[PDB]
Design an enzyme around this catalytic site. Structure first.
Site, PDB file in Angstrom:
ATOM      1  N   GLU C 170       0.771  -1.221   0.000  1.00 21.88           N
ATOM      2  CA  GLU C 170       0.000   0.000   0.000  1.00 21.88           C
ATOM      3  C   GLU C 170       0.812   1.285   0.000  1.00 21.88           C
ATOM      4  O   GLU C 170       1.734   1.511   0.791  1.00 21.88           O
ATOM      5  CB  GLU C 170      -0.876   0.048   1.264  1.00 21.88           C
ATOM      6  CG  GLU C 170      -1.513   1.417   1.520  1.00 21.88           C
ATOM      7  CD  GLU C 170      -2.631   1.263   2.542  1.00 21.88           C
ATOM      8  OE1 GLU C 170      -2.448   0.409   3.433  1.00 21.88           O
ATOM      9  OE2 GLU C 170      -3.665   1.944   2.480  1.00 21.88           O
ATOM     10  N   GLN C 296     -10.848  -4.151   6.182  1.00 20.26           N
ATOM     11  CA  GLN C 296      -9.731  -3.700   7.010  1.00 20.26           C
ATOM     12  C   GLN C 296     -10.287  -3.068   8.285  1.00 20.26           C
ATOM     13  O   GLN C 296     -10.946  -2.020   8.238  1.00 20.26           O
ATOM     14  CB  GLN C 296      -8.827  -2.711   6.267  1.00 20.26           C
ATOM     15  CG  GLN C 296      -7.771  -2.080   7.165  1.00 20.26           C
ATOM     16  CD  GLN C 296      -6.859  -1.144   6.395  1.00 20.26           C
ATOM     17  OE1 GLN C 296      -5.640  -1.345   6.339  1.00 20.26           O
ATOM     18  NE2 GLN C 296      -7.443  -0.124   5.774  1.00 20.26           N
ATOM     19  N   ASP C 335      -1.147  -1.458  11.959  1.00 22.25           N
ATOM     20  CA  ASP C 335      -0.618  -0.643  10.890  1.00 22.25           C
ATOM     21  C   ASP C 335      -0.479   0.829  11.266  1.00 22.25           C
ATOM     22  O   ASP C 335       0.012   1.573  10.406  1.00 22.25           O
ATOM     23  CB  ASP C 335      -1.538  -0.682   9.656  1.00 22.25           C
ATOM     24  CG  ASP C 335      -2.981  -0.391  10.045  1.00 22.25           C
ATOM     25  OD1 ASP C 335      -3.318  -0.451  11.240  1.00 22.25           O
ATOM     26  OD2 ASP C 335      -3.808  -0.107   9.156  1.00 22.25           O
ATOM     27  N   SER C 362      -2.482  -4.803   8.449  1.00 22.66           N
ATOM     28  CA  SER C 362      -2.956  -4.211   7.200  1.00 22.66           C
ATOM     29  C   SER C 362      -2.110  -2.983   6.907  1.00 22.66           C
ATOM     30  O   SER C 362      -2.593  -1.889   6.637  1.00 22.66           O
ATOM     31  CB  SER C 362      -4.429  -3.826   7.251  1.00 22.66           C
ATOM     32  OG  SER C 362      -4.675  -3.001   8.374  1.00 22.66           O
TER      33      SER C 362
HETATM   34  K   LIG Z   1      -3.775  -0.753   4.949  1.00 24.92           K
END
Ligand SMILES: [K+]
Ligand code: B12
Ligand code: B12
Ligand SMILES: [K+]
Ligand SMILES: [K+]
Ligand SMILES: [K+]
Ligand SMILES: [K+]
Ligand SMILES: [K+]
Lengths: 177, 137, 551, 551, 137, 178
Positions: C170, C296, C335, C362
């Site tokens: 990401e 998420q 995260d 995530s």
């Molecule tokens: K993420």
């Protein structure tokens, strides 16, 4: 008390202006941002930064939504340049422009506690340059991985408070500083 | 009708995955992308494929995923810029009731996107009651 | 006098964290709030007329969406009447198959399933998570960003991340107009590090779909949903616009998940006096109802909100477990920064790490936290060694692996060169060989030459304004001699055409082989069953740097 | 060129830790070694003729002792024939009662039970441990020591720890000859911080027993056993001398446990080619066989041995689980330094902290690790705020609580004045008012005035040589105005007359109330059953310093 | 014979607990200790109490513990010094077999410590086999 | 080869000595302590401190156990002063005394990585003062909480290796230091 209510702000009809839109409690129920800088210095510095670029600077208050993106959009719709500056009472700030999705922007300052008065000035300045259709170097990126750990809860609370002064469908007020 | 035992398609039945052009997965090469045999226009997933995947989801007991996939199959025939206009029209305070219904009629009449048309109609109705139409902010 | 014991304690980093007493009325409370609705359901002529004490007459857009699309009504009344303590037992009992529970959970109301998991301690939750996780194999997702939006470093850091084990990566932007540049860098680099890693560029909704329309991303994650309607509105969406968007991505053959997480409603000022967990449950059901495969959550970006209050970290585990129990893919946060304390953040991570989730983080930061444009992750690049050591100590597959410096350097270098080719072929503002060098041996943007961001932002917006698509990158790669990379990118596109990776928890491993909850079904049945670290994977995990050969 | 990334990584504290490759020949493998015997047992006319492959002809002292005393032979055949997987499943199955399992496990051979737990991951083991823990309520034990053996500082520190919640506290000595003073100070301050806290002074066996005879200790823990005969022999005992020592303690009404721990046999040079876990199971059965109620294990002082090798920290949890599963009290270690890394030591602690054990740590350091005479603990005084924070975060009772500075100063001051009074009363080297003040505000021995060590040492040994017992301490306290403490000390002495605290997991709480596995039976049966953190205990735990009330 | 229901002795049957010199728990007050109406010689657990706890151990499922307690029962009659002596004698390489057997003989004739002398006899026999006697190092 | 076995050490007859007992690999299979201080420099410093006090140092190799305590015990048994210093190849050191239980001592240095040549000297001085029947101040306590994290695994391996040279029933050998 520096921010004086005054009638319902209206459209521009003059490109050489930049609007600053601030939250329903800005300098009202709250007068300092989240790390205690008074709204007055921030307002002074943003206005100095824009004027300093030779652009008009207009300050209005928004009531429809406490969300900074939407505060700023309320402003960009009425700014003669198409450019607005949105600021919440906790200090979060965005430079926006007409035609942008509400949740898009020219520049964003997503970490209110790292903002300084010198920062708030530059923001007044880069906005003006945008109004001049110029592409200024973005204000440099300030990021601190402990800002959320230090302030996200505080921010939540500050924001919950300003949000009580949201009033649906009430148009933005032109203001005298 | 595709089942879990036909999954993954790439491995069990790659021949089921074909373009409106006869080309196969196997045809998507550097060599033909360069020689322009294959182009952007051959590389879009088809409704036929999305309905195979829906049938597999179903078989996997994920009915909701399958519904999504059916919606997606309808929307493959809708231009990207139209896709974006419709998504934006459903965002809060963007549209009138009438505009949403026009969008739903278009989906149905020009794109045969029956499910999404119904979905947009359902939204229109509820956006009245929950005041998310243009002028409600 | 001052106790010197307390002066030492006052100085600990943990005491820099934000703590608050519960604030029930503004929903500043992590779970089990006295304001949360008592579970209930009323069904008439096949439609819900009452949901958790609320009559349909009073339903908001969220209620309607959930009531209409998010609950299995055939068994709703049966499960409502089941004993919640017994369901909680079922959840952690290793001899009650996942397949026996899912038909049950998917018939619960948001309040009912909250009630079930609120009977559980974090040990019971982890015992149940290892069973309810949809993909048998745990995985990991990484953030690849930097404060300058430097595309060369991103390409380099992306390939290192792929090489270390992340199956999704990401990126995002300090300056939004850079975005096309971050996406292609991430993609190219991620592809170089391990063909098959999936990439996303997290932006405003209409902006992000366009980028996926152009072929510069292979999935999207931050497709936000929210737990109360006024917050949803400030999110600039409704359940229906989000449902339509989810189907729009699929219609372009792109995998996606929604993003949510406890605390968002509070942070954004309208919690409707409910607990974060209750509100988050509504988010999970919105996600189920829209037919999105995964979510998420685990507070994600608002982790400073539940962590401030009692049992907020337990509650983050609880929202992850509800996600998996509802048969959704769970990318279980870990995260985002919430604390100055290494002890504390380790505790928070272990909740997901130890049982394993679809994506344990995530967004583990694959760059130093100074460079992390999500304002910092719960783990960053300087923790890579600690992470590998703990996998080895507990014999847990955390998705990552020890790697050799010389391997990393070549791959980072190859990625930096691949991108250079691409800027060459697409006529974008060039990437000096000095830049390639730097990126190869960088730790962070502090080691990078800085670019002309105005020039860069000019040429990045032209990508979107001129609709230049991913095939240009592919030919430029090939044009620069990277026929390898060029093809690997074609293979993502091959995956998009077949749609197999649209399914629950799908990643792409090894030789372009999809690995999803459809073909990697979790079959946990207790000790010696389900996923077990072993064989060559175990060998790989054992081989940390610094292990002296005893003799 | 170097990678700045790997350079940053090389500098992280974890890379200072000792790691090694498995060295099977020398037992430098944590569990699942190929040299470990396969489970077997042969019985003839009520006597073992074969134990895990070894004929009785080949038994060493350990095999004989276990074979004769350590295994329930009535069901040994039965359990031997059961599937190890099913037994492991039973361990973590919440609906299988502890009472159903104990008759099974206490019938197993050492190899059988190791094989059973080796099928489990750490999640399953923690799910099992919350059930197999003997006492329903988890507790904590602290180290109270300083580098100068300063008795005044031990008293103050002992009082603070007791105040913070430890129910057992342990001292020991830089200078051996100092021991009597350490114990009396430990015993006085502890009773001052909370009457009933049990105290021990860890020494050479014969020296410790005499100390206990003289009345200056409440219990003994470091009563060592070892898993191979040559190592037991260098430990200067046999299973029979240690079994005799355990009864001698009991014959004096003193509670005691053995100590062992994975890696000791490797550390002492004779592992007989077996894994640490197999060897530790022998130590657990030696404990069982001797009729000892409980055990401190989990590698303990040798933790740098299993932690060096793969799955070492999991084997540490597994050895704790075996202890509990054999219906032995488990003082689960977490008391000894093995890593420079806060993340890594946290992961190690949570294995026991999350499900709870009889004593989550068998030696949390109640002083800063500089003063830790056990060469440092996995946690110390400066981690107190973190531990409390994690307790609140996960809603887990770790046995400790937040306390106020003024409360602590006051209880520290009262203990110093009490020991000053004691010393005056017994004619020991004065404890000046400055010393009392310093112990009050001290963080560690850095904050303490130096003492005539040679002198102190003189009168302390005299305590031995002149047989001065704890009644001198009691009258000395009442003489110096400390009637309270005097009675409180009498009470602990009175507990040794009744024998109640000799039972499995006993501690003394509230009003002189024994709390053991006999009257505090663990009744775990899944979610919402067994021990649950709630009510006033949770209110106490919730109340950490720094929490803003949004008001 | 005591049962789990009978524990703790100090709550359910304090009367059951007396001391060496035959005193009561309640005999143990600060003033009686001040006054010396109770001493060091009277604060020792008795063989009877240890046998009450052994029965409760047995009742609680813990046979090994109970046996330990039974041994503890016999050892109450052995003075501290001799306890230390015997414990030391059982450590590796301290005793001759004959010396251990004399200790056993003593434990049985002087003290009637029947279980403990068998335990020592057992030790001596195995110490011969595993060479842990004096001169075996 | 600064160490040569010159036959079986015998019981000291005057109270003017201290015995230094070293493990079976000391100055043999192992030549340095756990942090590379030469076995040659440790004994030299050890001997210097004893001799520095007007006492004689006699050195012997022990074989019946590699355990530092038992090593020392063999030596306190043969010491004309009843005082010994036991030293393992990895550096661990103990000052022992005839009549003490084996796992008891006068002074113990249980964290070998912390010992310096000066410490050893000091250790040798305290011994002599003990043999002289003085009551010296104990050598200052050396304690590092990270000692075991960095060196326990290393110590177990050095101990395993030295432990191979153990010989059951074999009387200590008197040494001549080259
Ligand atoms: K993420
Ligand atoms: C927390 C967070 C959020 C939270 C809370 C937002 C809120 N309105 O309360 C959640 C998850 C809901 C959120 C949502 C979104 N976010 Co956001 N968010 C952040 C994050 C991770 C940290 C900010 C922070 O904690 N600052 C510390 C506190 C003390 O300072 P503060 O000034 O009070 O912080 C406020 C602002 O950051 C603001 N905010 C957060 N995100 C956004 C986004 C936009 C466009 C605006 C105007 C404001 C805003 O919310 C904070 C709380 O009031 C940043 C990363 C970063 N670089 O800072 C991303 C970030 C700012 N978010 C971003 C984006 C894109 C969005 C979304 C538009 C995504 C989407 N799917 O729609 C939405 C916008 C929704 C909205 N109305 O704000 C981008 C912006 C990129 C750019 N503009 O150049 C960032 C940089 C990275 C990312 N992808 O997450 N976000
Ligand atoms: C690890 C350890 C052990 C381990 C390993 C011992 C071994 N022989 O291999 C175990 C748990 C088995 C152990 C046992 C005992 N220990 Co111990 N042990 C330690 C500890 C916690 C740390 C040592 C360390 O890791 N050093 C770092 C390494 C890298 O350096 P090293 O030189 O190689 O360390 C070695 C020495 O410490 C030696 N050693 C350890 N304990 C003892 C005890 C004595 C009497 C001797 C001579 C040597 C010795 O073992 C280490 C490894 O080989 C220390 C605490 C401290 N302050 O150091 C206590 C400590 C040294 N132990 C202590 C005691 C009392 C003992 C026992 C007598 C207890 C008992 N129940 O009998 C036994 C003796 C067994 C024996 N034959 O050595 C005391 C010593 C008191 C004194 N003499 O002044 C200390 C200071 C702690 C305490 N006070 O409780 N111990
Ligand atoms: K997005
Ligand atoms: K939420
Ligand atoms: K001991
Ligand atoms: K052991
Ligand atoms: K302990």
């Amino acid at each position: 008390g520096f921010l004086t209510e005054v009638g319902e702000a209206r459209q521009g009809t003059q490109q050489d202006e930049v609007i600053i839109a601030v939250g329903p409690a800005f300098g009202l129920a709250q007068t300092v941002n989240i790390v205690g800088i008074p709204h007055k210095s921030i307002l002074r510095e943003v206005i100095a930064g824009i004027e300093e670029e030779g652009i008009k600077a207009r300050v209005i208050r928004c009531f429809k939504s406490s969300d900074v993106a939407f505060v700023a959009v309320e402003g960009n719709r009425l700014s003669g340049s198409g450019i607005s500056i949105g600021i919440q009472s906790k200090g979060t700030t965005v430079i926006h422009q007409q035609g942008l999705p509400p949740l898009s922007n020219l520049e964003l300052f997503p970490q209110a506690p790292l903002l300084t008065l010198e920062t708030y000035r530059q923001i007044g300045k880069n906005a003006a340059r945008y109004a001049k259709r110029e592409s200024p170097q973005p204000v440099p990126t300030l990021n601190d991985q402990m800002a959320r750990p230090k302030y996200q809860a505080k921010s939540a609370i500050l924001h919950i408070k300003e949000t009580k002064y949201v009033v649906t469908g009430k148009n933005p007020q032109e203001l005298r500083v | 009708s595709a089942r879990v035992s036909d999954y993954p398609l790439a491995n069990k039945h790659p021949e089921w995955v074909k373009t409106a052009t006869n080309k196969t997965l196997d045809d998507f090469t550097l060599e033909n992308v360069l020689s322009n045999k294959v182009t952007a226009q051959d590389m879009r997933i088809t409704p036929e494929t999305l309905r195979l995947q829906a049938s597999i989801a179903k078989d996997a007991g994920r009915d909701r995923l399958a519904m999504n996939f059916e919606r997606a199959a309808e929307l493959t025939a809708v231009p990207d810029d139209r896709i974006l206009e419709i998504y934006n029209a459903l965002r809060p305070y963007r549209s009138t009731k009438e505009e949403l219904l026009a969008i739903a009629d278009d989906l149905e009449s020009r794109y045969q996107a029956k499910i999404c048309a119904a979905f947009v109609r359902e939204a229109a109705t509820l956006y009245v009651e929950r005041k998310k139409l243009k002028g409600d902010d | 006098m001052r106790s010197k014991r307390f002066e030492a304690l006052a100085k600990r980093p943990v005491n820099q964290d934000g703590f608050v007493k519960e604030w029930i009325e503004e929903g500043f409370i992590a779970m089990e709030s006295p304001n949360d609705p008592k579970p209930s359901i009323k069904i008439v002529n096949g439609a819900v007329t009452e949901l958790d004490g609320k009559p349909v007459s009073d339903f908001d857009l969220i209620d309607h969406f959930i009531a209409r699309y998010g609950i299995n009504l055939n068994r709703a009344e049966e499960v409502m009447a089941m004993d919640s303590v017994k369901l909680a037992n079922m959840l952690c009992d290793p001899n009650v198959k996942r397949s026996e529970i899912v038909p049950l959970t998917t018939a619960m109301t948001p309040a009912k399933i909250v009630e079930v998991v609120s009977h559980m301690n974090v040990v019971e939750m982890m015992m149940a998570m290892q069973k309810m996780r949809a993909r048998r194999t745990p995985s990991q997702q990484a953030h690849v960003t930097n404060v300058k939006d430097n595309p060369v470093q991103i390409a380099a850091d992306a390939a290192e991340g792929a090489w270390r084990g992340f199956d999704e990566q990401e990126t995002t932007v300090a300056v939004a107009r850079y975005a096309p540049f971050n996406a292609i860098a991430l993609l190219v680099g991620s592809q170089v590090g391990r063909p098959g890693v999936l990439t996303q560029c997290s932006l405003e909704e209409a902006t992000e779909l366009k980028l996926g329309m152009l072929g510069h991303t292979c999935y999207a994650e931050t497709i936000s949903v929210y737990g109360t309607e006024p917050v949803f509105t400030d999110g600039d969406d409704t359940p229906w616009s989000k449902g339509f968007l989810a189907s729009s991505y699929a219609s372009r053959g792109l995998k996606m998940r929604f993003t949510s997480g406890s605390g968002s409603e509070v942070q954004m000022g309208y919690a409707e006096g409910k607990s974060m967990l209750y509100l988050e449950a509504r988010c999970i059901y919105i996600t189920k109802a829209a037919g999105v495969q995964g979510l998420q959550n685990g507070s994600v970006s608002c982790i400073g909100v539940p962590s401030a209050v009692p049992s907020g970290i337990r509650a983050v585990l609880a929202e992850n477990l509800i996600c998996s129990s509802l048969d959704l893919e769970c990318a279980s946060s870990n995260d985002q920064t919430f604390t100055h304390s290494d002890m504390r953040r380790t505790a928070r991570l272990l909740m997901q790490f130890l049982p394993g989730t679809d994506f344990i983080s995530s967004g583990y930061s694959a760059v130093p936290n100074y460079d992390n444009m999500f304002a910092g992750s719960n783990e960053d690049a300087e923790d890579f060694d600690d992470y590998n050591v703990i996998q080895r100590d507990l014999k847990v597959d955390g998705g990552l692996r020890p790697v050799r410096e010389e391997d990393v350097i070549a791959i980072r270098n190859k990625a930096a060169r691949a991108l250079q080719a691409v800027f060459a072929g697409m006529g974008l503002p060039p990437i000096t060989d000095e830049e390639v060098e730097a990126a190869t041996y960088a730790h962070g943007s502090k080691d990078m030459p800085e670019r002309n961001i105005v020039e860069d932002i000019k040429f990045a917006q032209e990508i979107i304004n001129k609709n230049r698509n991913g095939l240009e990158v592919v030919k430029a790669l090939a044009q620069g001699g990277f026929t390898d990379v060029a093809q690997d990118m074609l293979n993502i596109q091959k995956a998009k055409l077949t749609g197999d990776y649209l399914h629950t928890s799908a990643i792409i491993v090894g030789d372009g082989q999809v690995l999803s909850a459809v073909n990697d079904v979790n079959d946990y049945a207790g000790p010696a069953t389900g996923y077990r670290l072993q064989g060559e994977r175990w060998e790989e995990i054992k081989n940390i740097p610094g292990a002296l050969d005893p003799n």
